[PDB]
């Protein structure tokens, strides 16, 4: 083709993900030392958000500035579909910016945008997956690799609801050959189709996956990860409804961390509902890496933007 | 004076419009070859939008980045008029940005902004005209000039409603000495005052204009252009109402294109209502140049911004 | 510490404020001569607005571009507090931008943001004070210093309501050793706590302050300053209610200016309600400096941003 | 291969030379309008001079600065050949600069440098030819094209000694399909091998060439070109010796220009020996373009450097 | 005209020299604070040296880099005059660099270069004067202004030979309205024509000048300045010859400084012959400012280059 | 202190040398990928050469351009010492450039320059040592580390004369904990004082050193290094004299390489005298890394310049 998209890590090999991590960490280190590599000079990113965002939006906008380009915030309601067709919007934006991202209510919207645009398209989260979160989370696990452990020998346990972030964490950990668990209650577990995709990743990678409601599954976790309980932006569970499903068994508290292990690190994509999926004590505690993880939303987005723009330039000399 | 505005092409000569085209195409060619001329370094554009926009807004914001400056999106509701007077807003913005554009509900708002501001002001569309569309459309017609034809010998036919874009296309084609037709139904034709202005342009240019409901008027068109049927943002015609006025006589379909001529190119400012003013077959067909035309919204805005900033610097050494 | 904030000028000495003025005016002069000092290259400012703004918002966004960085407009409703705690938002933004500003409904919000963020935080106005307005106003008074007068011998009279801008003007004038008066009606005067803070400033500076409803207080003013009468954004006084309190005694009209003195300059933070706190004749008259003052919102913000980023870099080598 | 050299225009087609002219003139026009295209950013040119130079050396050094790179002056005596072999010098410099030029006493030296270096090598003049002079001279003739004439219908007459510049002018004019004459005395005419190469160029181009001692050959010249009479830097003819050969028949004086034609333009590569090959009256006269021609040494070198670096980057992605 | 030269300060007013000082010191302060104003971006300076130089040459070359341009070192022997006429060299260089300087054996050479070039020409020292030294020395005296003294009330005494630097110091001090003395032995004093020029400066400035062999003339000097005794580069006095003329009466030693005054500062253009015109004790002593003075060769050259390029751009829009 | 010099690696620890290698290789990799880190923006390097140079001079000049600064070539004969004292030259240059290097005839000259200058001074080779060669050579050995070997287990054998490069190679290899041999004839071996310094390095590093005329010493070398036989620039041995001392025993030929080992790499600082210290077959052969080594003169100089400028900025905030 003449471009590459980042809609799902399912289209990336382990080697490509490692390259993305390595590129991201090199850029991070330069900036830490006071030097900003101008790798996207005069390039323009269209940023389409159908939902609210702090970390994803600010990461894209900051990343562009840091690398010498600019991000344009197209707020909820440039509509995807509607009166103007997605084919028209996609072809028009392909002439007016160099690269696109979109956070979408429905996954088909990002797929359609990628299919119809002739410039790189990045999924900034859908109801299905969250691939920039995957890369940031991988950067974070690499930086916080336990002493004497290979990445592939790490155990990553996601606690709670089968969110798009849960699935995405499963996708990236299995892609990298790691050991993944979704610890969640029946009715809120990764589904058969999700699990088939995790198995497919493991066939190649030698990693493992388990989906279970067994509380002992947290034992030996190197990373213990959670997310909110209220579901999707269009149809939230109420406090009473979600507490009924998840509390207290799926609350990440100090007792759960102690059971997972003394050096187990706590992760959360954020925003967090303190007192539901995680207690103040854990998220603010010595083993929380969620703020390093949030920083790495920017770390990973810088590397990804550069990778995709380099690919585009290679295909369009 | 100490600045120049771009409110209407009525204040520009043919020679100035050619200069704007030539400048725009030089910048376009540089960028096509991977080089971004930093002609607006550290300059700031205030972008006031009273209505939704994809092409105009993204073109301004991208243009500024590409040329080394920045565009600020001032969303619907910095009010023009209201509690704070237009004189105050204009004088204040003149101290805080280098150049302004505004897409306005009512033409007097852009006129007032231009009259009261001491920096260049650009009309990003009003209920009266659409002069940046004119320049982009002219760039497009120049690029797609038929073999063996001079620009002045081209025939440009606008089909349908007497929109501000219809009038603007009349203004630019007549300014350049071309042959213009508005093919539209009685009651929805360019009015007496519009036509007097077209005649005035032709007195100088030697071009021609005709406003007619004769379907044979499309015959021999080099460019066949249309726009939506629903009218102005504040007071849309319903689907039933606009179909009653315009359908099927004013639908640009393959039969109309065949009648216009085999090499006639289709143009539309966009967004398009597929199945009303144009069929899928035409807009997606081999003779459609509307996506090149959309790209040239950015092409023309880059040249215009540079022209106006150069003029400002010449007057304010 | 590892950063410095700009929440109130109460934490700045006279010498520091002079340094800020001098830095701001040097940058202004360079730009006047066509040279843009790239003092914030690749730096990112998060701009959180809980209320509407023309001058503050555009000043921050333009300042960043002029100095080689970028400002991100985070529109009303990234919430401060709410579902996601202020501690979380603050720590997250500290990883994703280099510097923050916020215009807040309630002062505690900016205090909390500053306390929880590890990057510099700037108050873009609260219900308590308006410190960037202070610096811009000081730059303006320095530029318009009366012939043969020291800054400290100037008399600055604020007319009307005890707005946050009124208090801020009191804070800066007393900090610089000048003579301040709030001329306002009983019930709408700077309160006991405000006045205690002004007295504290004067203990150090040798300046003076008076809060009074005596109309003779305007006599001998070098600067006569006013603001709107309708109160705070969340709870406005109606036209009838505010006219009943303030009109005509507190209307700045030509007669009041004549009484203050022939060379007294008129100031207003803007937006102004013409016909209430000021007449057209005064604000558009020969002794009005409110548009120079508005320009100096940008002048002062450039200097402040550079000062705070330099401080940050000094503390984080 | 992995690079391209500019040792002789014999390896360039007419289309490539036109491209070089067009690129050079676009860059010239940008700079005339105050804009410097940064097309060689951070690139380093090694400049090896075995002989003195004003125009060639300054053109290369200025060109690099203008385009965002740098030229290094390697003065007579980094030796080519000698104790360190040319193979070693060439391979070493290929690691330490991006592009090379050399003005050489003997043509084999530039050939050897080009053959052994893996970066582009440019001939800055040898005893055989002078290809950057060719391109500058072509740019000059294009700019000064007579009214109503095609380039190919122009007549270019070189007067005097069969210098490397004489031969080079023959090479470029015949490559472009023009009509060339060397008007020179027997014993000092382009030799049989030179003429065979001119005939070979004309076989492709349809141009013409003549080598003659007939004074009537100047009649109808559009460009009349000359050079010094003293021969090569290592073995100059004395004043008496060269006057005996060339004077007065080959002196370009006003009478010769009048005979050539009223609009014939005078060219000289410079430095000129006033009173020998040209009189003060001609070189300082209204029809002299030698200073425009000297400027175009820089014009052409900018275009060439960019062309060769672009070619290198295309071959080494 | 279309440019301005800097051949002698005789063509500059006191106000222009103050502007040059002020500009130079602003640039110096920026660089001291770590910021390099890019005021000469992509501009090229030709640097012609007929004599050796450390301070002048390095100052020009460094200044260009610091301000975003480049200086080209044209070493002794691009000849001025000779085989190629000065008119030709001047016109050719005017096409190939933006600005020129030259250090020349004979003053007429710099005059001829300035007269024939259409770009700014700067005198880098001749046998007559040294105007960049003047500006650097003035910057130095301003920075080291004695407490409680105006510039005009300062006494500047040059000791020793009537060098071009001696005369230049007389020219600048008298231009600025200061009090100048040349303390030198009969036969080696500023001549009648020099003194007539100093008187002419004083007619305008109200300054004073004296040329004398009275040793009491050093008393009350604020600045005591000297230079070498060996004369001009082409015809040096031997050690014995110059000692016979000048030693010990004109040796600046600690006794002379004590007599001049406790706060008198020692200046020397450098290079110095330690043990002749100055002792180690003085030049390395607490009251020596010659290294600050040497730094200000660069300070002044930066300001001058910018001033002349700005003037050129103003005249050639 | 307020700066750091690079006169000898004797003042650097193993950890510092590793840091220098790592920094150099990061910069090299960026440039290989088409990105030039602007780490020395607007910085000026004075380059003083008392002897001829290709690799050192071009490396410094190119390095400065690549990193956004500039190098000034001060050719043989700004004299160090002489009429103007070294103290004066050093103090003057400290005001006029940011960093200095010098290639000197006598080591005391670089020591004096470093001691008297207040800016970083780099030794570009003396009669004693060659520390930039050390760093380039170390970068080269790291890049060409044999499979399955640690740097410290490598054997490096220098063949021939006890040149400054021989000693320097001993210094760096022993500093890094490697195993060094000088294989050279009696009378031309590293002397007692050299060897005492190598022993001192080994006391810390655990490396080894041997100085011997035993031809079996080459056996097991991982790197086999040589240099010219003619001695120092001021007093060369003739061909007959040096052949008498060194030939054929110390000629690096294919037989010697075969004896050293099949994967032993050949190194030479260059220029090489082919047919003396090395045969064509070896230097042009598959195991020669001398051109990679020459490239790494630039690799190492980039890292060193950045390291020293960063150190300077840290000490002079
Ligand atoms: N399951 C959650 C996932 C939120 C991911 N968070 C982020 O990407 C951080 P942001 O929203 O601040 O960009 C949901 O559906 O809302
Ligand atoms: N008659 C139409 C004109 C739309 C012009 N379109 C554009 O300028 C493209 P945009 O809206 O995406 O900027 C109307 O009044 O709506
Ligand atoms: N008392 C007024 C203060 C307005 C200050 N104005 C500004 O800062 C100018 P802006 O709102 O355009 O940024 C109020 O509470 O509204
Ligand atoms: N036949 C002459 C050619 C000189 C060409 N001149 C130039 O290239 C101008 P320059 O020497 O100033 O670079 C000779 O052999 O000397
Ligand atoms: N009278 C002395 C003047 C030297 C001025 N010195 C300088 O300009 C310093 P520089 O030579 O290092 O540039 C002479 O004729 O030599
Ligand atoms: N022993 C040799 C060392 C030469 C080192 N070579 C280099 O540094 C390469 P260069 O001279 O090209 O910079 C001698 O004394 O000459
Ligand atoms: Ni922006
Ligand atoms: Ni240079």
């Amino acid at each position: 083709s003449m471009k590459r998209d980042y809609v799902t890590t399912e289209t990336y090999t382990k080697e490509e993900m490692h390259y993305l991590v390595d590129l991201s960490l090199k850029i991070k280190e330069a900036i830490k030392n006071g030097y900003y590599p101008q790798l996207l000079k005069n390039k323009s990113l269209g940023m389409i958000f159908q939902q609210s965002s702090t970390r994803t939006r600010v990461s894209f906008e900051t990343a562009m500035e840091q690398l010498g380009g600019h991000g344009e915030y197209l707020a909820p309601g440039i509509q995807l579909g509607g009166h103007e067709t997605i084919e028209d919007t996609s072809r028009v934006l392909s002439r007016l910016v160099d690269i696109l991202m979109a956070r979408v209510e429905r996954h088909h919207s990002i797929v359609d945008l990628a299919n119809c645009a002739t410039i790189p398209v990045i999924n900034g989260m859908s109801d299905y997956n969250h691939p920039t979160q995957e890369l940031g989370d991988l950067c974070t696990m690499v930086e916080h690799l336990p002493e004497g452990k290979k990445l592939e020998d790490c155990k990553v346990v996601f606690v709670g609801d089968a969110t798009q972030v849960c699935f995405s964490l499963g996708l990236i950990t299995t892609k990298m050959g790691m050991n993944f668990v979704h610890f969640g209650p029946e009715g809120f577990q990764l589904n058969e189709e999700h699990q088939a995709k995790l198995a497919k990743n493991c066939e190649v990678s030698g990693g493992s996956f388990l989906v279970t409601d067994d509380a002992s599954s947290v034992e030996g976790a190197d990373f213990l990860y959670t997310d909110v309980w209220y579901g999707l932006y269009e149809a939230e569970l109420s406090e009473e409804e979600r507490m009924k499903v998840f509390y207290p068994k799926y609350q990440v508290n100090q007792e759960m961390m102690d059971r997972a292990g003394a050096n187990c690190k706590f992760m959360h994509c954020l925003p967090a509902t303190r007192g539901e999926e995680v207690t103040d004590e854990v998220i603010d505690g010595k083993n929380s890496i969620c703020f390093d993880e949030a920083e790495n939303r920017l770390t990973s987005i810088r590397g990804l933007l550069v990778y995709l723009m380099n690919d585009y330039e290679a295909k369009n000399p």
Side-chain angles (χ1 to χ4, degrees), chain A residues 2-31 33-78 80-105 107-146 148-149 151-191 193-199 201-202 204-232 234-239 241-243 245-254 256-285 287-312 314-317:
Chain A
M2 311 303 292
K3 55 106 173 221
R4 187 172 193 177
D5 302 305
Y6 192 78
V7 171
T8 174
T9 60
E10 294 164 87
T11 66
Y12 285 73
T13 65
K14 176 174 181 188
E15 289 65 45
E16 291 173 323
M17 299 309 303
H18 264 132
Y19 186 94
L20 281 163
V21 172
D22 290 344
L23 177 55
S24 296
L25 296 185
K26 289 176 180 186
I27 294 168
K28 184 181 183 180
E29 194 198 24
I31 291 169
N33 285 97
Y35 185 78
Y36 294 83
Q38 300 304 275
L39 297 164
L40 299 177
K41 189 63 185 171
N42 297 294
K43 302 298 178 179
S44 298
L45 166 74
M47 309 182 298
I48 300 168
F49 279 85
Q50 299 200 132
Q51 300 163 338
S52 64
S53 172
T54 297
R55 288 133 283 252
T56 306
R57 179 263 178 90
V58 178
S59 290
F60 274 108
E61 203 168 352
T62 293
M64 292 302 297
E65 169 56 26
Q66 288 180 331
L67 300 167
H70 180 246
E72 307 175 358
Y73 182 73
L74 316 178
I78 300 177
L80 296 181
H83 160 79
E84 184 161 31
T85 63
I86 190 60
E87 290 83 9
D88 287 352
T89 294
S90 298
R91 282 179 286 180
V92 166
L93 291 171
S94 294
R95 304 300 189 104
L96 303 181
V97 293
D98 301 293
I99 178 157
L100 279 162
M101 65 73 52
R103 168 166 287 197
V104 296
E105 297 188 32
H107 192 71
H108 78 82
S109 299
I110 194 71
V111 170
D112 292 343
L113 186 64
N115 287 162
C116 295
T118 56
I119 56 172
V121 173
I122 300 167
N123 177 1
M125 189 172 85
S126 70
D127 55 346
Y128 170 71
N129 72 331
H130 197 354
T132 70
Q133 185 74 55
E134 293 180 43
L135 184 61
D137 289 341
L138 181 56
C139 288
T140 307
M141 291 181 291
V142 168
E143 287 180 321
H144 286 277
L145 242 198
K149 278 210 175 102
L151 185 70
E152 293 88 355
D153 291 325
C154 290
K155 179 174 178 176
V156 179
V157 178
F158 183 101
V159 183
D161 192 21
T163 70
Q164 76 287 84
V165 168
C166 172
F167 179 49
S168 259
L169 189 63
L171 283 176
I172 194 59
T173 55
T174 58
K175 175 59 52 62
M176 303 309 290
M178 309 170 74
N179 303 286
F180 177 72
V181 180
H182 179 202
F183 172 45
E186 289 185 336
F188 300 82
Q189 288 177 163
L190 291 174
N191 66 34
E193 291 64 41
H194 286 133
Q195 293 186 50
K197 289 184 168 206
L198 300 187
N201 277 187
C202 291
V204 176
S205 78
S208 72
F209 81 97
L210 175 63
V211 179
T212 185
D213 63 354
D214 183 351
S216 75
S217 65
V218 306
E219 293 163 20
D222 299 290
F223 301 96
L224 191 63
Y225 197 125
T226 200
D227 193 2
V228 297
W229 290 343
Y230 45 76
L232 288 173
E234 99 266 341
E236 338 287 359
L237 289 182
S238 70
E239 192 185 21
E241 290 175 327
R242 67 203 187 237
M243 289 284 288
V245 172
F246 294 107
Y247 182 100
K249 183 170 174 180
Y250 298 90
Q251 176 175 83
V252 184
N253 49 214
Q254 188 54 237
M256 186 182 287
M257 293 289 287
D258 292 342
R259 183 180 191 165
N263 289 301
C264 185
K265 303 296 185 178
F266 173 77
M267 297 179 71
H268 192 311
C269 52
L270 309 181
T273 311
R274 288 151 172 273
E276 286 187 22
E277 72 274 9
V278 64
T279 61
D280 292 324
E281 178 177 21
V282 171
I283 189 168
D284 290 329
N287 282 16
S288 180
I289 65 180
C290 64
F291 301 100
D292 284 351
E293 183 187 2
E295 181 178 358
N296 284 335
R297 293 300 312 289
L298 170 56
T299 299
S300 55
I301 279 167
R302 289 188 298 238
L304 177 65
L305 288 161
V306 170
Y307 183 92
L308 292 176
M309 290 303 306
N310 287 170
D311 178 86
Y312 183 88
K315 291 169 178 168
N316 303 88

